[PDB]
Design a protein around this ligand. Structure first.
Ligand SMILES: [C]C1=C([C])[C]=C2C(=[C]1)N([C][C]([O])[C]([O])[C]([O])[C]OP([O])(=O)OP([O])(=O)O[C][C]1O[C](N3[C]=NC4=C3N=[C]N=C4[N])[C]([O])[C]1[O])C1=NC(=O)[N]C(=O)C1=N2C(=O)[C][C]C1=[C][C]=C(Br)[C]=[C]1
Lengths: 133, 666
């Protein structure tokens, strides 16, 4: 029914190795080589990759900036509102970023802000200036 | 199986079915009612049993009826027909029995039998008992032909056949009861020893073997499923098939390694992408921290755009650190996932140098068994005789196989030292012209009704002809003779004054160094009472080694034997013999095989008798005159003693039918 388990033999594969006297040792060399021709290319990329690991040397440790650990808040200070308005100019609709930047405002308060002050801060205008970049 | 059905089996017959040959003797029965068929069948089996249970004395129609029971011993016309059929075709009363009904008063018809092989001998005894006048012509100064047994002092070794292949349904079983044979079983434990003389270890041994068996199965698959039987006109040999299978097993081992390492680059090529995105992150991160520091200079209280800058760069920065952290996350995983792949690769090779050398010994054993290079066997057909394998374990003839021919020979008219040279067969009869092998100009002429030819196929093959047919055999016969294969296989008999091998071990193999020499002295047999070792030359070696002198051979031998058992365990041998069957003019080989481009059907062609044309034109078509028996004429049991012996039983039947008529078929 089927070739004794393991043993490999398929219709096309067989016509391939019998086409002439040395198709035998031809298809076996084209593969012996495709092997070295990939083993080499590994050892190459291995060295390329081992250079890059030298560049990432020591990680990014000495450039981290301590955590902005700080609680939320309900009132908008004139301070906060100005920071907000600028974040919008620079971050568009990324309410997440805007939040982090202002510091003590939740990703929601932010979107709320967007509607209440939309009127007085021409937030339409601010957004379309960000869009124009 | 056993009982009355035990017999039918032990007689190579189906117990619950009528054979092709019964259908012809008994067409009335088999075309008739399912009911009588069973009566026939029972009578047959019971009669066989009767014979089998006591094959040391003749079994008569008298004694048979005697021991049957009603309802079956009612129709005595039938029981007679049956006992007669079995007697004629040699299923009962064959070999060496004690005869009850004495030998016919005057004899009828005259048969000249060529060759006193086991087949000839077997035929001769049959016809003689059937009341015919028989004479055998034998070129050699002894009987048994390809059953030769070296005898000297106490040394006894066969350079001919030496194995009996299992008593389950073998006629030799019957014979071994009739004749003094010491049958001894062959313990199939066979240690191999590498070229250097170091025993190959169980780990390898068993794993190589089963690859061999797996390789054979493989070839069978190519033949029956993938229909790989002809390669641009040339028909495929088993060797061709085996190579194509091994090639494909390499081609796979490679295909593996490729898409393994090919699966590594693809990963490295990810690690590379990562590290680039990861470097250009450090770049920006480094370059931002700078700016943040600059904008942090501007000492508070700042206006808000300057505050915004500080706050904003501090996000932008930590934001990109979150990114670079996760890329260091990935980096770590990709990097264990390469210790994964680098740790377990697939297999390095299909077979090591040392493996494909042991596998060769296995291929050697297979060549030994077919007497030929695997590159000559027919793929489709080489093992057609398979389903007829006897049960029971193989044996050897401790006191030498000749004991059998010598016993069949007893009471027969045999002319030794008589080489047949021409067979003339014409409408009114045959004449056979032999010469004396000793002084060859001295001539002999034997005239007879029929000629039974047991010339080995090697002999029938010779160019120019060693025997001449007049008129020549028809092209349908001679083509069967080209087409069939006649192999070769030699023996070396080593006679020592002491055992120095493992006494309890029957055989052990030497592993040659090359494919080309895998046949050479590859296997030794411990078989006999005296200290004799027996070594085989098989396959491509067998033929080549015939052109090398005995001394050189016995040398290469002792060497191999010292290499195993230690350089001074092994004395000079007291007596040595070296067979050369291809060179032996009355054999010209060892036994047949199914050559590529043949088929078992050629064996049937080999056996069909020849019928000479008319003398006077428009005289009626005669009787057939020339008959054939022998190892090469028995489709289902070729190349064997039992198989010859049967072919001879067969012809005696067919000859009697022709010349004494067939009473039982009415
Ligand atoms: C060779 C051989 C060896 C070495 C081994 C073996 C063998 C072989 N095998 C086989 C047998 O042996 C055979 O087959 C038989 O024997 C055969 O028989 P036949 O047919 O009968 O034939 P022969 O015998 O040959 O006879 C013939 C005769 O003839 C004569 N001639 C010729 N010519 C002439 C004459 N005459 C007159 N004139 C003229 N011209 C001659 O001389 C002769 O005699 C085997 N088998 C078995 O069974 N067993 C064994 O063991 C064997 N061996 C081995 O080892 C192996 C094989 C086998 C196979 C298969 C099987 Br299943 C088993 C085994």
């Amino acid at each position: 029914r089927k070739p004794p388990k393991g043993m490999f033999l398929s219709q096309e594969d067989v016509e391939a190795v019998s086409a002439n006297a040395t198709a035998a040792t031809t298809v076996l060399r084209q593969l012996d080589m495709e092997l070295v021709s990939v083993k080499r290319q590994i050892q190459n990329i291995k060295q390329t990759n081992s250079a890059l690991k030298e560049k990432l040397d020591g990680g990014i440790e000495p450039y981290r900036l301590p955590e902005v650990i700080q609680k939320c808040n309900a009132r908008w200070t004139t301070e906060e509102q100005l920071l907000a308005v600028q974040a919008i100019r620079k971050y568009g609709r990324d309410f997440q970023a805007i939040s982090d930047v202002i510091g003590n405002k939740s990703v929601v308060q932010v979107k709320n802000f967007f509607v209440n002050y939309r009127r007085r801060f021409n937030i339409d205008e601010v957004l379309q200036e960000w869009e124009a970049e | 199986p056993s009982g009355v059905e035990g017999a039918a089996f032990q007689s190579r017959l189906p117990h619950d079915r009528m054979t092709s040959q019964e259908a012809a003797c008994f067409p009335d029965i088999i075309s008739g009612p399912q009911q009588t068929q069973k009566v026939f069948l029972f009578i047959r089996n019971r009669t066989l049993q009767l014979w089998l249970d006591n094959p040391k004395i003749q079994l008569t129609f008298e004694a048979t009826l005697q021991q049957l029971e009603a309802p079956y011993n009612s129709d005595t016309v039938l029981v007679h027909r049956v006992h007669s059929y079995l007697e004629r075709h040699g299923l009962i009363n064959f070999g060496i029995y004690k005869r009850i009904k004495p030998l016919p008063t005057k004899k009828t018809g005259k048969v000249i039998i060529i060759g006193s092989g086991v087949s000839g001998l077997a035929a001769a005894r049959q016809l003689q008992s059937f009341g015919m006048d028989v004479t055998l012509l034998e070129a050699r100064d002894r009987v048994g032909g390809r059953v030769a047994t070296f005898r000297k002092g106490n040394y006894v070794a066969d350079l001919g056949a030496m194995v009996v292949t299992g008593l389950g349904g073998n006629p030799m079983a019957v014979v071994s009861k009739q004749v003094n044979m010491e049958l001894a079983k062959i313990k199939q434990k066979c240690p191999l020893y590498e070229a250097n003389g170091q025993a190959v270890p169980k780990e390898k041994d068993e794993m190589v073997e089963q690859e061999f068996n797996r390789l054979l199965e493989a070839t069978s698959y190519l033949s029956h499923q993938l229909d790989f039987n002809v390669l641009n006109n040339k028909p495929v040999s088993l060797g061709q098939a085996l190579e194509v299978v091994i090639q494909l097993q390499e081609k796979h081992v490679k295909d593996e390694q490729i898409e393994h390492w090919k699966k590594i680059v693809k990963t490295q090529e990810e690690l590379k992408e990562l590290l680039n995105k990861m470097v250009n992150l450090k770049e920006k991160i480094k370059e931002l921290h700078q700016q943040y520091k600059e904008a942090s200079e501007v000492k508070p209280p700042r206006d808000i755009t300057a505050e915004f800058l500080v706050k904003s760069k501090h996000r932008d920065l930590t934001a990109l650190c979150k990114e670079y952290d996760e890329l260091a996350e990935t980096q770590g995983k990709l990097e264990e996932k390469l210790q994964e792949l680098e740790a377990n690769p697939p297999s390095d090779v299909y077979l090591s140098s040392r493996d494909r050398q042991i596998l060769d010994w296995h291929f050697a054993n297979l060549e030994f068994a077919n007497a030929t290079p695997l590159s000559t066997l027919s793929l489709k057909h080489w093992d057609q005789d398979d389903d007829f394998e006897f049960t029971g374990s193989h044996l050897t003839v401790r006191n030498g196989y000749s004991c059998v021919p010598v016993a069949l020979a007893e009471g027969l008219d045999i002319k030794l030292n008589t080489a047949v040279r021409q067979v003339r067969y014409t409408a009114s009869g045959c004449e056979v012209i032999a010469v004396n092998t000793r002084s060859t100009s001295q001539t002999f002429i034997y005239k007879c009704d029929a000629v039974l030819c047991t010339l080995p196929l090697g002999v029938l093959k010779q160019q120019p002809p060693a025997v001449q047919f007049v008129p020549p055999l028809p092209e349908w016969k001679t083509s069967a003779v080209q087409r069939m294969g006649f192999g070769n296989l030699n023996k070396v008999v080593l006679c020592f004054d002491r055992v120095f091998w493992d006494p309890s071990v029957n055989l052990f193999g030497h592993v040659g160094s090359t494919t080309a020499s895998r046949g050479e002295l590859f296997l030794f047999w411990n078989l006999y009472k005296a200290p004799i070792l027996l070594a085989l030359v098989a396959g491509e070696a067998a033929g080549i080694m015939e052109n090398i002198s005995d001394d050189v051979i016995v040398g290469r031998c002792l060497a191999i034997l010292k290499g195993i058992f230690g350089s001074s365990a092994v004395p000079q041998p007291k007596e040595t013999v070296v067979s050369r069957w291809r060179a032996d003019p009355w054999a010209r080989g060892s036994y047949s095989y199914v050559a590529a481009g043949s088929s078992g059907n050629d064996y049937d062609l080999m056996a069909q008798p020849i019928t000479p044309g008319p003398s006077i034109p428009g005289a009626p078509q005669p009787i057939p005159r020339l008959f054939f028996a022998g190892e090469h004429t028995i489709r289902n049991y070729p190349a064997t003693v039992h198989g010859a012996l049967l072919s001879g039983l067969r012809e005696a039947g067919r000859i009697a039918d022709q010349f004494l008529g067939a009473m039982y078929t009415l």
